[PDB]
């Protein structure tokens, strides 16, 4: 635990650690929701586990996947208030980039911008980090399918395929085993439906459970647009496999 003035602000501990950032990382995994992101030949798929423990809650109003712009989609792990705050900030940043530089914002630049904001939060004493982990997925015109992730510490990096949540280790190990088996670093399917089916099967195998149409939230990013699949589409994908 912390000891001294390094309990409310972000300053160095005697061991050279920032405790508030670590506690924000702890806060990120308090939603008990796992997400997966995999890039195909010409598409990107994000699948988030959906839990509705209360039947008095409208399922259609529960969503952690946001449409930042035409081509960029975002998935947030953590509490929904900071998720929505980050979504609004990302929308504003993408629109301002498009206005100022004359072309659409790529995923990596947006991830770097959010990481710089996170660094501001981690260095300023009177500002606190957002306890959320952000994953931007798109199909950049210069780099193809792209998945990038940023954390409360201000660190961002791109992934061939990524998993997040309390049970992210098993999914990551299964993904590494699949990549070693295939050694192409991506998914060979040429249709986004097949990539969604593969992601569903991988999630089912990793978590050891079977989902319904209301237990998943799927977003697909193509070259032209990013769209979130509805309940009927997920049900069709489940019936197919």
């Amino acid at each position: 635990s912390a000891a001294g003035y390094d309990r409310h602000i972000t300053i160095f501990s005697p061991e050279g650690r920032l405790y508030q950032v670590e506690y924000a990382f702890k806060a990120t995994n308090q939603t008990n929701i796992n997400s997966l992101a995999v890039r195909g030949k010409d598409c990107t798929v994000v699948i988030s586990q959906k839990k509705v423990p209360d039947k008095l809650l409208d399922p259609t109003t529960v969503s952690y996947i946001f449409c930042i712009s035409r081509t960029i989609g975002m998935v947030v792990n953590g509490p929904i208030p900071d998720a929505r705050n980050a979504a609004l900030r990302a929308k504003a940043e993408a629109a301002e980039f498009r206005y100022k530089y004359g072309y659409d914002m790529p995923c990596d630049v947006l991830a770097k911008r959010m990481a710089n904001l996170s660094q501001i939060y981690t260095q300023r004493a009177y500002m606190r980090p957002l306890g959320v982990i952000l994953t931007f997925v798109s199909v950049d015109e210069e780099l193809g399918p792209s998945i990038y992730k940023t954390d409360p510490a201000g660190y961002y990096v791109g992934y061939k395929a990524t998993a997040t949540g309390p049970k992210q280790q098993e999914i990551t190990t299964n993904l590494e085993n699949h990549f070693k088996k295939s050694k192409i670093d991506h998914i060979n399917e040429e249709s986004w439906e097949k990539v969604v089916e593969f992601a569903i099967t991988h999630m089912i195998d990793a978590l050891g459970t079977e989902f319904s149409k209301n237990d998943l939230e799927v977003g697909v990013a193509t070259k032209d647009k990013f769209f979130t699949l509805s309940a009927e589409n997920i049900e069709e994908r489940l019936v197919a496999i």
């Binding site: 609004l88 504003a92 940043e93 301002e96 100022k100 501001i120 260095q123 300023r124 009177y126 500002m127």
Partner: protein
């Protein structure tokens, strides 16, 4: 929703319009020695014969930011402009370096000018009175 700065003129003038350089003997008159402006610059001369572009340049970025805040308020709500202004005020208030005038890195990051250069940055900008640390401390803390 302005593009060119507007209402840049002053509606009224006074001898004590600048409270920071008020004379201690007569608080209703400016102190010419501490102004260090040459001693022959009445305020009236600042109302006539000005370049028609100085006001536009000195209020350009502020006008653009105000238009952006207005658009956010119209589209997103009050929370977004409130948060932007709160962050900017917090960054500005906690920085006090009397020996430099360069802006902080965090301010440039918030203003989305990390990799942008204008003539203000290239050209940021002796006296016997009022150029020490104590004057800046008094100005900062309202003493």
């Amino acid at each position: 929703m302005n593009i060119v700065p507007q209402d840049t003129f002053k509606s009224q003038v006074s001898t004590d319009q600048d409270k920071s350089v008020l004379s201690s003997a007569v608080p209703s008159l400016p102190d010419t020695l501490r102004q260090q402006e040459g001693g022959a610059v009445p305020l009236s001369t600042q109302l006539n014969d000005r370049h028609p572009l100085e006001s536009t340049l000195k209020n350009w970025e502020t006008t653009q930011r105000q238009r952006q805040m207005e658009q956010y308020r119209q589209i997103f709500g009050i929370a977004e402009p409130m948060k932007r202004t709160m962050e900017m005020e917090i960054v500005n208030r906690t920085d006090f370096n009397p020996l430099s005038t360069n802006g902080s890195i965090h301010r440039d990051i918030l203003l989305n000018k990390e990799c942008s250069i204008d003539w203000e940055d290239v050209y940021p900008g002796s006296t016997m009175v009022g150029d020490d640390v104590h004057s800046k401390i008094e100005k900062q803390l309202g003493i």
